[model samples]
Target chain A: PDSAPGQAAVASAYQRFEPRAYLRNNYAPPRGDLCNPNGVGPWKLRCLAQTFATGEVSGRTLIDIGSGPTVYQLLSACSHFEDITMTDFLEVNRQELGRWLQEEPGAFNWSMYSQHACLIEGKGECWQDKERQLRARVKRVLPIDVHQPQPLGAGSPAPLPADALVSAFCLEAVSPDLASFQRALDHITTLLRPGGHLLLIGALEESWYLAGEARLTVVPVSEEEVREALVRSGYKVRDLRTYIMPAHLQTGVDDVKGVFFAWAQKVG
Target chain B: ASAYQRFEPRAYLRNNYAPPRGDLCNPNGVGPWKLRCLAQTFATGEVSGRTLIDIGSGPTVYQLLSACSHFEDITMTDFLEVNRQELGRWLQEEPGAFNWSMYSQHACLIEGKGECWQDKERQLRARVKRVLPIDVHQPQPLGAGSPAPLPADALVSAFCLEAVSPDLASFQRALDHITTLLRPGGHLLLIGALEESWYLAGEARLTVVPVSEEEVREALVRSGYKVRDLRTYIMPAHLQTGVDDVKGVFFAWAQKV
Candidate 1:
């Protein structure tokens, strides 16, 4: 295959709307499978919880870019922030998040994820309390176009520049090449206020991942590229953790060879 | 570094150094830039050193054949014992060893001398006096096993440092470690891949600390060397071959200052 496809081609491929099925296989109950050491699900949840517990994540306003259709990534940080905003490129994903927030019937159940987060946090078995906390903290679920210079665009009013922006598996899944990945990172940094923190969770050396019927491409990245991309995006990495996926867990949902969690802060 | 530590020499030979289809032998097909550039450099180089040390030589003699005519003493070194054994097997003309007669002929053609290929191979075999272990990651590459420290008049390395080092800083440190073996004013011939993220050496994919021309120049300067010459050869798209998309090959000849 060519090294990287064009940006528009990658975008059009992800524009397919099938959030329910994608979440069902990737993040929903029984299907989640975080306990398996081979899978990244458990480590990702623990890393997020640990980051929040350690005070590396602090802000009056927080935003999760390309939030997808799940709230597990935000479960740990909900208590620390005053206002939480979630943004996505797809309307179907936003609708899924809205359904979960509204407690609408037939909405994707995330109680399993909430339970996992609480267990990792050592917060007893109060999964429902944690879920309620996150649901109440999230103020807005808006549409975001990360490729645009102004990610929110003109028609929708953007929230105040966030003190922290957290993104997971967003940039690499969308950008066609290293240059575009760096550009997308720069685009997201504009939404952060000066000195704002960025927590990035991404796959390493993953060429492609299957979400429902769509096979989305990923720009294979090395630790060197992750370090380079962050420096180029005007952030100094504060803490970086990397996990190599076990051989048994690579069962085709994603060719995610490894995962990385980087905590960085905007430099003046 | 651990990933490369487990590199299977036999598999690497089969995958990248096998005849005709392998990366080294396909000069006309997938573009054997390694053989072409190393042969071209040695053919035209000053080659006046008394002792030539081939650092991290991975079971291949293509880079050393042309230099054999110029240097009286040659020492081939590798990090893995298996690779060293392979080199020894070829030198001793053991059964099932890789044939270097083709490479010898290619070098002779580049040298413009009417020397027979057998004679060239014999000269290379005779010149190579030792096959020892070297770990570029260590400050003393050969460790404390040697009787005494020995500095060479020239050093030639190809694609080993980048493949072994985990990051750019370690790559520089390894260059510094190897430079300790070369005397001041000694010539250094370095050849490596450019912009190659990783390569399939047997079944395992080894990482390469990708470097740009500027990074190469900077590392050489920082290592206390004055670069004498630098050349790059880009493989045509048709010759890329799916195993690796090595953007180009780099050859640099510098003097330790």
Candidate 2:
């Protein structure tokens, strides 16, 4: 059997397979006992949106670090943030990002998300009307190579550029190694220009996620360890609320280990 | 000319409209305005030691029962004979529904001339007083040797103003009819739906022409009733219910000079 895909190779393999994998596993509508792939269940999304609307996260810019096609977090972030910038490593990611800029001024329909718009609804100048009404101040998008030293745009060859950085089901598959996970986290924080926010949501039921062609093992990092890592890496840690989507919905076969979600921010 | 020509009330109300039950039947659904209107009308006693009349009273006679406590006697009238029979039956069944301790209050369901209130359990004679099919749209004159005499001191036209008339002018004329039944110092009390447009019952949708506070007030003045007090209440915009926003009725009180 082929050895596990390395950090640089994993990025390339993911660039080829992960988006389709996510679409197949989660985005489509539920049939019979199965939930839809594209639909985020109601209560979970409501609780998260309510927490955001509580005013603490409003009026800020959002930077989704490694967002996939659906970009569900970006939708919730719209209620709070005025601007959003999404960065992903794949060419398909950048192409989808561009399409999202073309659809309705404030809505993100899944089919339109794939065929017409980019990373999120209102990601580009497309949703100008909604931006005006919702007081969405600005939106900037960029695509960058993680293995390379140079960041996406305008910032130093050094770090991620944003007020808040969000990654979902990402970062964990960086190479199935601790060093690559740290490097990925570094790239995430690099985007945050100090005192920005960070939210990371991933499936912890399994060590790695398969993109059809290969199985990528996620290096296990406990919730507490993630907190320590955030503090050590310059995030002051505002609030850490955890949400576990039932096991049936996650990519892993295990029903007990579900999707885990977290939100935090850069300190400096 | 019909003998009842002087008693023309312009605003036409159908007898079918009744106060709601359960959640809606709380004495004050819209607000304190309704209670104040009822209380103020009673407080002004041209009604004491004199006769009172409640036109178009429905199933629940709480308003009538309460007024009987204050006035010497009350005659509840409705166009529907079945409604009168049911109300009469309910009153007979529940004697406590009316406070009988103070005086021997007399009440019976009437079914027109010579039929008289014959069931004598209450030991009161049911005199037909007067019997005529009263029409409110056209002017009708009554009380010159009618079966039951007119010129009552207090008349109550509650929860019936919004039905018969299409607009303000007719509403004014209806008030005129009630005033014509009164002696000059006698008073008339009017209560009605101020914001309701239409309501549903089973498969039927009953439409009502709603009147604003300004319209009702002007109509009262034009109808020759002096202003006693004016009041209003409203339900705010609903934020939670998936349904759109709505508001409640407006309440007004006036007395005939």
Candidate 3:
């Protein structure tokens, strides 16, 4: 398929993606269970907390490449950057993000995640303050396509080159194959200034995961290949760590064998 | 965990190895004896494989020096953060007290790999794909749902189960737990203390289960292993300078039935 249609297929597949259904599968029970010390949520929040604690990733603007109706990625990152932009491929996700940002009645309860992020950061700030701070900093919830060379396009908030980009499970989850995954990463790289950081969280060796009626395919990646791609994409890997998912948490929603948390600095 | 938390690598290396004891020339030395034991087993062609795991590696690269040639994908494991960092130091950087050049040169020559010491070390680093945290007490030694391919072709452990495990029963259970990772008919190259109770590393006096050869053989049988070859080295009185009460060390090459 052509590059345009490759993404077209993804968009069509995601058309059936109901935000609340996806949320319940991913953010509730087994996967999201366990205490402040264990589980996927704490591990991811810890990666954010530890990365920012170094003060190396703080900047004026932070852009999340694909928010996918979730806000936990920005909880720790929100305190670091002055302004944050949440972008997703689907407008439905934009609305999903908007509902939470606007404090609409039916938005998912992210207070637990906010509180977990606060606990990991140990800022002593109330979960409400952290949530409000993230909401205030998120100035825009716009549509984006990582497949585009100019993802945000030359429009309002046009061609914004972010100081840091936080992309979780987007490039691998949506891209058709290895080449597209690489090209998509390169595309997002163009949106960051030289020497900027990218906090990448992605699945390893996963093929497909269900989200409502949409069963999304992910390009299976390995531990070695992740490092290889980062170096090939003109980024110097600062730190990379992996967490294995327990068999009990397999949940049939996704066969995500493990997750990789990579902090890569774009090489000058 | 707290005891091993403050366990210093430099002191541990200096105590167990790094000359006087860790030297190669002496006929009675533990270092040369064990290296030769592992290298000889690797020559058998039965232990050859694509993937190998070093369980309870304890900041030591000497065991894998010979294994580096046989296996392309090697995973090194440790329970403590310090030990893992110590391995990373020796493998990539040099944040450790001891240098393994002598051990590398010896192990490489013993395996007849034809590569220089430096090349062998570089090959080992490239092959060891992961350094994961492992606890034999758990049903999943490498932890649950690891991306690393399960049912490896071969497994290697040196002084791990008996040293850290509390009792002989736990030692056998740890043996059974790690056995799950190896495929049926896969090889297990094991080295551990014989009748040793405890050993001191810096401020921490870690406990050892003092396992006997009878127990080792019986445990292998119960764990569904066919003991192909088993050998032990009696620690002479001169080298038994009271670091620990290790009467001897056993080397076993068992194949899963």
Candidate 4:
């Protein structure tokens, strides 16, 4: 809905590259060497996960607004929220998620980081064990674009409504500009009932994130932007933290700002 | 979807979820902030003689009960009838039955329908004038095409939204109707589960989805409000410790455009 020709073209071009597979490929250390696994990147991820976990630790339904390819965060949410919904805009990603969902442990080719990500924090083992025990307990991958039609729960979006909604490295990629980004996020809140919770994570210095051949400019998001958007969309900012990557493969450096993590709630 | 049940005013809901208290009430200190935020809307003189619509008000009646100086009328609703009836009965108690001294410096309750409100009667009626029965999720019986108008200039609901609709759209619609009942610029104050779930209360079972902060903002925009301001906090208390290992509560405050 907020997509212009240039941005849409960029996104379309990026989609063709199957960025999910590529991101997965480089998400590990040594062989992989992705930013999220090393340095401040992992710290941000873990901290974001913890804060988000605190938000929905007692919830019944959890909804991940931009679930990307990996099941890492959704599975993490399942530990707290009784039910979870993982959604994305790209059907290919959804299909990929479905395929991954069916694969047996150790069936798919995974990087060391992918393997270690689950184990290092003790959350990995807990996630896998809990996921296996609650197979299909989590909702299937759903489709949602932060700027698309609002999901009221009666239609195709999801059957079970979310009590807490989350997004990481999601809005920044799609939002070419701050206004559009805020609008898209406004739609995300449309999915949350008043008094619901929202957890957001993404790059702070995102000039352009890679998606195959095309480059998507996040226009840079910060804690201030996050708070402004929250107020604009009728949410109250609860907490915010910024994270830097010690080493980012894309940046070829370690000091780059990796992301911003924030938590907000709907005010009725 | 659960059937529409008449609103009650009971302190303890028979519903399965446990009523959060103490530090849990703050849920990041947001509960207090929400209450304060709701009060700011009345900084104007409109509430001085206006009525209010309290949907699912729970037991904390001070917010509505104290509105007598600003509003000439009040109507509080809750899913539990016991709460409404008990609050109503408690207001009419003889000396010592209801605390009149706390607010006697201001106003008091009126006796019977259309009865004069004296200094002695100001305590009870000052906060709440009437308690109505409204179940927001169901199509209200005011008639299919016709919806009931809000009897007050503003609407205040604390800890009510998470229990009503199955989805946010329904929540938006519910708010829309509340705004519909108000004149333009009328205020709406709401406080409930920030990121909470349906928990086990006694034996009954209730389910609630944890709404994210972004989604909350989006809903407000879609519902046609400018979102004056919003704030959130977390409280650590009476968390519905599911098999999962996380614990906490979310809170917020927002007003109609």
Candidate 5:
């Protein structure tokens, strides 16, 4: 098997990654498994929500590395981190994010997700406030290449590196091998100031998954591998949690065996 | 239930560690057999490279005795401060420090250098550019903004990761972390226990994540290395009477491709 996939191949793969189809198939309606409390979907969302709600993940700035056309991950951080920057490898994904941020016609509806997040966070009535705050805080949606030594390579909106980095299902999904995964992690770490926080949520034990017509490959990772990778990336595991999906929730949108939520603090 | 305890360097160094014995010092014993293979590997192969980083040196220079002649610069690393201090003592030839000349001479003999152990020792001591702290769990195990160069020409490690890692997954990640230190086509030399559950470090019984040849090979391949050679050694029954349970040792030479 070719360990390093070509740029055009990967780009073409992600170019077809449709956020609406993904959401519709996996994270459907008012409360699909992706947002329901009983399933693993809410675990990562709630994990970040709790961290930001308690101000544990708050800082002057936060950059969501590989923000795959969704704002659900950043809903809690909007109120805490004064400046928020979201980046994705693909322009299509960035465009999707932009459409939502701009409130454009026919954009992916994330109001249900915001409402779901608010309910899980016990701030049900303040869903509108959270949604508005997230919209306001997301200052820029830029392109990122985690493979590069400098992920935000060349052009970046902020002069200073981020105070916190939030990534979900990005590094693992794209990285072909463990070395690339570690390098991507190191690259992401360089974007944060010393002692900044890194919140990572991703699929575990998954070798491949479908993202539209393109079947993407993932570097299968164990729970221990995630813990070790964070530590190697210069972060101390602050709060590490895992959610094993019930056999029935295997919707086939992605062959994610399980999910992991890690709240780590960069250590000097 | 396992009676394994955490590794304590100081206690281990004080209690269990001793200079190589006569039988083990010679070519037939497990120690000499492993060292001889390493010496032969370096002697016959293309080893002269820009840099060689020894991950998890663990107060031992036996592995690098021959490689020093082949590589110009050597960087030794250890996880614990005490282990670094122990290595420094040997490099500086402190009073009461453990003598490594026997192993050095063993390598010299294997290299057919004819009792030039002192020269080998001196070259190794001088060749060691830096003895620094390392955390294999970290991405750049040498630390952030580390002065040490990456894509090292070669990396030699023995009994380090298996001793430190809590489980097999951690071991695999540590291996991957170390793999980043070498450049493409650079060499990786790894030596560790095979199918052993625990080892004694003085009075402390440290746990070992028992691994098989298949597992190690799988890990090497998964971590993006092309295995060139892998050899295993079963301990003679007499050598198994030590504080630590004796099973076998494995030596693997691989390259990043």
Candidate 6:
């Protein structure tokens, strides 16, 4: 099966995706509270924080490959690099990030996130500093298609060979199947520098998610499959941390049984 | 307000470092003198830390060669994108990047650490954690969104403050701004032009604040630094090609109070 048709299907299906509805479905309720150390919010924040603290994954330019509509993914990373460029396949998600980054009216409230990230990193700065730093480090919000050879398109800023790339649930969610997911992983690798890092957080097995009117399908990637994909993409696995989803926290948003957090370095 | 928007990093390298001033091998030259000052400072082992930052690194890795062994993580910063790209190229050893073997050679010899020049370059490349963008003029020099943590252990800024700021007051404020990046008691190794007004680097004619030895010392003390050692170097008449009227240069090792 050629990927052209499936890719178009996603582009059209994903168009029905609403950022506000998506945020509400996933970010509220049990998954929303960053103050709750055992919640999914802290789960993601602590994982990201610990990975960066390892000191193995860092650089000047960090590309949030497929930033989605969330900013928490970058709260820990904003402390490590000077320039952060976030990209997405949709203008809607890009606009969502721009609103929060600019601190404009009606932006998604990430105050809880900023506060939690500060605590996780063990810093004394006001939550304003963490959010302010994220806003300042984000130089641009551009378009990216992971399936393309050049994910950042023909023209972009600090696009390729970035110091590090952090993608949360973008590859598996966009990729049509296991083959496509594996291919997408390799496609995005071209943007990462040799000896650079790629931090990935994705769902494991049984994934078809509801976002507004769109019933987006995610390739059910097994945890080992994620590791295999990295090896296939010429990445040396540094750390592959996995989290089992408790039934109560599932919220039926998607049938994601588990999540995998991978810290893989591009082989030089 | 940003005169450096037109400042060319490659031309600045050629104008001040290559040709008329690129006497990298001449131990008697100013290049060696600057390297010696930094190497001796590092050799003392008093300025050791987990992280060392080179503010306004300006496409040069020579400043951090000796620092690589002392710090586990080394961060280099510049205001210009071209300068950052230049640094990335050299760090990655990309083709057509500028050659820095001579500087590495000189740095290793001065350190007397029994390491080969190649090993030093490789070590420095690995230890150089990132080459990020920075503006000393900004109240938050590294920006709020900087990817790393702040309060760096030690800072070494060479030819950045005096060469980038528009005037003396701005230079003083700029120093004050960067002071926040370093923790209390952290040391700053500052090297810059002495009484130089303007310099040519290809198409851009960058203006300098024209700081004297007294002004450098005074600026440091006023900016919360307790000066430990301050030295100056007058330009050799033979190497002064008139590209800039750099009367002298100052090298100061000061600790933040």
Off by over 4 Å in 4: A1-7, A30-41, A52-56, A104-127, A133-135, A151-154, A247-256, B1-257
Native interface contact recovery, all models: 0.00, 0.00, 0.00, 0.00, 0.00, 0.00
Docking class of 6: incorrect
Model 6, range B118-152, lDDT digits (tens) per residue? 67788889988888888888999999978645788
Against the hidden reference, what TM-scores do the models get? 0.49, 0.45, 0.51, 0.45, 0.49, 0.51
Error of 4 at A42 (Å): 2.6
Going through the candidates in order, what is the number of backbone clashes in each?
Answer: 0, 42, 0, 55, 3, 10
Best by TM-score: 6
Residues B175-238, model 1: lDDT tens digits: 9999999999888899888888888766567888888777888899999999988878875675
What is each predicted model's overall lDDT from 0 to 1?
0.79, 0.49, 0.83, 0.55, 0.77, 0.84
DockQ scores for all predicted structures? 0.00, 0.02, 0.01, 0.01, 0.00, 0.01
Candidate 3 Cα lDDT to native = 0.83
Candidate 2 C-alpha lDDT tens digits along A1-268: 2223575567555644655554555554331111222233432343345556555654456666666555555655665665666666666655565555555433334422221111122122122233233323325456655544444645533223556666776676553555666666765577677666666765554465555565555676666766666676777766664555553455452222444556666676
**DockQ, cand. 6:** 0.01
Question: Between 3 and 6, whose TM-score is larger?
Answer: 6
Q: What lDDT tens digits, residue by residue, belong to model 1 across residues A1-268?
A: 3423486787688777478777866675333775443457878887888888887679799999999998888988898888899999888899999999999887888765676676567633245678888888899998887778888777555466888998998988888878888888999999899898888999899988887788887889987799889999999988888999777666668788889999889987
lDDT of 5 at A75: 77
**Highest-lDDT candidate:** 6
Ordered list by TM-score, greatest first: 6, 3, 1, 5, 2, 4
**Per-residue lDDT tens digits of candidate 6, residues A1-268?**
6889888878888989989888998787667854345667678888999998887777799999888899989999998989999889889998898888779878999876776666567543346677878999998898899989778877667646799999998999998898999889989899989999999998889568888899998889888899999999999998898888877788777898888899999999
Worst 10-residue lDDT window for candidate 6 chain B reads: B108-117
- Clashes in predicted model 1: 0
lDDT of 2 by residue, B1-257 (tens): 12112212211111112222111123233322343345455555544546666655544443443355455545566544544554565556555232221111111111111111213223221221222333355464332443324666677666554655666667678667656776676666666766655543233344556777788788888877786766666643321121212244555556666
Superposed on all Cα atoms, the candidates' RMSDs to the truth, in angstroms, are 23.5, 19.3, 19.6, 24.6, 26.3, 18.1
| TM-score, A chain, model 5 | 0.92
